[PDB]
Enzyme design. Structure first.
Site, mmCIF file in Angstrom:
data_model
loop_
_atom_site.group_PDB
_atom_site.id
_atom_site.type_symbol
_atom_site.label_atom_id
_atom_site.label_comp_id
_atom_site.label_asym_id
_atom_site.label_seq_id
_atom_site.Cartn_x
_atom_site.Cartn_y
_atom_site.Cartn_z
ATOM 1 N N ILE A 32 0.811 -1.231 0.000
ATOM 2 C CA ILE A 32 0.000 0.000 0.000
ATOM 3 C C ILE A 32 0.835 1.268 0.000
ATOM 4 C CG2 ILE A 32 -1.990 -1.122 1.104
ATOM 5 C CD1 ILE A 32 -1.225 0.201 3.783
ATOM 6 N N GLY A 38 11.956 1.956 2.226
ATOM 7 C CA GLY A 38 11.406 0.601 2.071
ATOM 8 C C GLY A 38 9.941 0.649 1.614
ATOM 9 N N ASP A 154 11.223 17.334 9.063
ATOM 10 C CA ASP A 154 10.830 17.062 7.680
ATOM 11 C C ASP A 154 9.313 17.139 7.509
ATOM 12 O OD1 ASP A 154 11.425 16.675 4.980
ATOM 13 O OD2 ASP A 154 11.587 14.481 5.236
HETATM 14 O O1 4E3 Z 1 5.659 5.483 8.283
HETATM 15 C C1 4E3 Z 1 6.016 6.402 7.457
HETATM 16 O O2 4E3 Z 1 7.060 7.154 7.182
HETATM 17 C C2 4E3 Z 1 5.229 6.288 6.458
HETATM 18 N N1 4E3 Z 1 5.862 6.968 5.334
HETATM 19 C C3 4E3 Z 1 5.240 6.750 4.119
HETATM 20 C C4 4E3 Z 1 5.822 7.201 2.921
HETATM 21 C C5 4E3 Z 1 5.204 6.994 1.713
HETATM 22 C C6 4E3 Z 1 3.966 6.361 1.712
HETATM 23 I I1 4E3 Z 1 3.073 5.971 -0.177
HETATM 24 C C7 4E3 Z 1 3.396 5.879 2.886
HETATM 25 C C8 4E3 Z 1 4.015 6.082 4.115
HETATM 26 C C9 4E3 Z 1 3.369 5.621 5.279
HETATM 27 N N2 4E3 Z 1 2.149 5.076 5.286
HETATM 28 C C10 4E3 Z 1 1.803 4.673 6.561
HETATM 29 C C11 4E3 Z 1 0.647 4.044 7.022
HETATM 30 BR BR1 4E3 Z 1 -0.752 3.605 5.773
HETATM 31 C C12 4E3 Z 1 0.543 3.781 8.375
HETATM 32 C C13 4E3 Z 1 1.606 4.133 9.220
HETATM 33 C C14 4E3 Z 1 2.814 4.706 8.761
HETATM 34 C C15 4E3 Z 1 2.925 5.009 7.376
HETATM 35 C C16 4E3 Z 1 3.912 5.608 6.531
#
Ligand code: 4E3
Length: 342
Positions: A32, A38, A154
């Protein structure tokens, strides 16, 4: 040829497989999200009987160690917000699996840039912008508590997620480049469009850098467009100057990088080094459309967008964009501002 006994690709990422079971506990559903760190997968936690998001960090030491910092800060924060009321993503637990650090989070939706795309880059309403502002200032108040003293470093629309795509509730994510006030290490920080003047100038910084970023984010949420879209640091500073004028002399006099952008004249005053609007002539008043129907004139004839409303929003943003980090508005006072008197 072979990466991590066949579990990884050539980008240090785990090869996600739909339906894989991990540790007699998680059933992986689907990818997702992903980013430099990562990947993020939706998985069912069979033990807690709920969906979770698992952030699968790259199998590469620099990424691992960035996420270890993130885990420590999340554990510190979460420990002091057990009711999850201060708008910081909730880390449930972590583990190492097949040479990847994995952070298990609550499920969330997409980010505020995705929301802007959903508006066709025309902006969300002033009322929704206010709701995002109130939650963000409450988060910054919590980060400023002495036991935390966390500088996110950030903030940008992409690091603020919706809980639900149809609702206004948010969580801040990505503490991988964060630090604490007692323990500042980085000189190069903040994504460019959202980077504070004190960082551009090579000066000491504190939690106020995050308030600068917030002011930038909130304007962009309402207009649809970044406020200061620099292509490089010199362009970034020049775009800030177009709106806010030359920074105060007392700041430039103490700035290691002043002469990257400015020159000091015989009379002691500072001007830009030699394509831009003259300093301070690109008015926030006009960017917001305070008296002319909001951004693009598109809020003319809409409720929830009066001149009076716009003047309060403008005032708050200008306090967030104070060049002086000592006088820039702080979270407690941002929350008391008339913009949130409704
Ligand atoms: O956990 C995060 O840094 C985080 N960064 C994301 C970067 C790109 C995208 I595309 C999705 C991210 C992201 N999506 C999350 C969800 Br859904 C639940 C908890 C943490 C995150 C998280």
């Amino acid at each position: 040829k072979v990466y991590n006994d066949g579990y990884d690709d050539d980008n240090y990422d785990y090869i996600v497989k739909n339906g894989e079971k991990w540790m007699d506990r998680y059933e992986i559903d689907s990818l997702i999200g992903k980013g430099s760190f990562g990947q993020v997968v939706k998985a069912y936690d069979r033990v807690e009987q709920e969906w979770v998001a698992i952030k699968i960090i790259k199998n590469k030491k620099a990424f691992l160690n960035q996420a270890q910092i993130e885990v420590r800060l999340l554990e510190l924060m979460n420990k002091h917000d057990t009711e999850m009321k201060y708008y910081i993503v909730h880390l449930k637990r972590h583990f190492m699996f097949r040479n990847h650090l994995c952070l298990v989070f609550e499920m969330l939706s997409y980010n505020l840039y995705d929301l802007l795309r959903n508006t066709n880059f025309r902006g969300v309403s002033l009322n929704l912008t206010r709701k995002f502002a109130q939650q963000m200032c409450t988060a910054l108040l919590f980060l400023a508590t002495p036991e935390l003293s966390i500088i996110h470093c950030d903030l940008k629309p992409e690091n603020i997620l919706l809980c639900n795509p149809k609702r206004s509730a948010i969580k801040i994510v990505d503490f991988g480049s964060s630090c604490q006030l007692g323990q500042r290490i980085y000189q190069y920080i903040q994504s460019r469009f959202y980077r504070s003047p004190e960082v551009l100038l090579g000066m000491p910084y504190d939690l106020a850098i995050d308030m600068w970023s917030l002011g930038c984010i909130l304007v962009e949420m309402h207009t649809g467009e970044p406020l200061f879209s620099g292509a490089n640091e010199v362009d970034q500073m020049n775009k800030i100057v177009e709106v806010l004028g030359i920074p105060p002399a007392h700041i430039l006099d103490q700035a290691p990088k002043a002469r990257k952008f400015f020159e000091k004249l015989p009379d002691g005053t500072w001007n830009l080094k030699k394509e831009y609007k003259p300093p301070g002539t690109r008015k926030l008043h006009n960017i917001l459309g305070v008296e002319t129907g909001g951004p693009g004139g598109r809020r003319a004839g809409e409720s929830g967008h009066t001149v009076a409303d716009y003047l309060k929003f403008k005032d708050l943003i200008l306090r967030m964009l104070d060049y002086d980090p000592k006088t820039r508005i702080q979270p407690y006072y941002a929350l008391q501002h008339s913009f949130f008197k409704k």
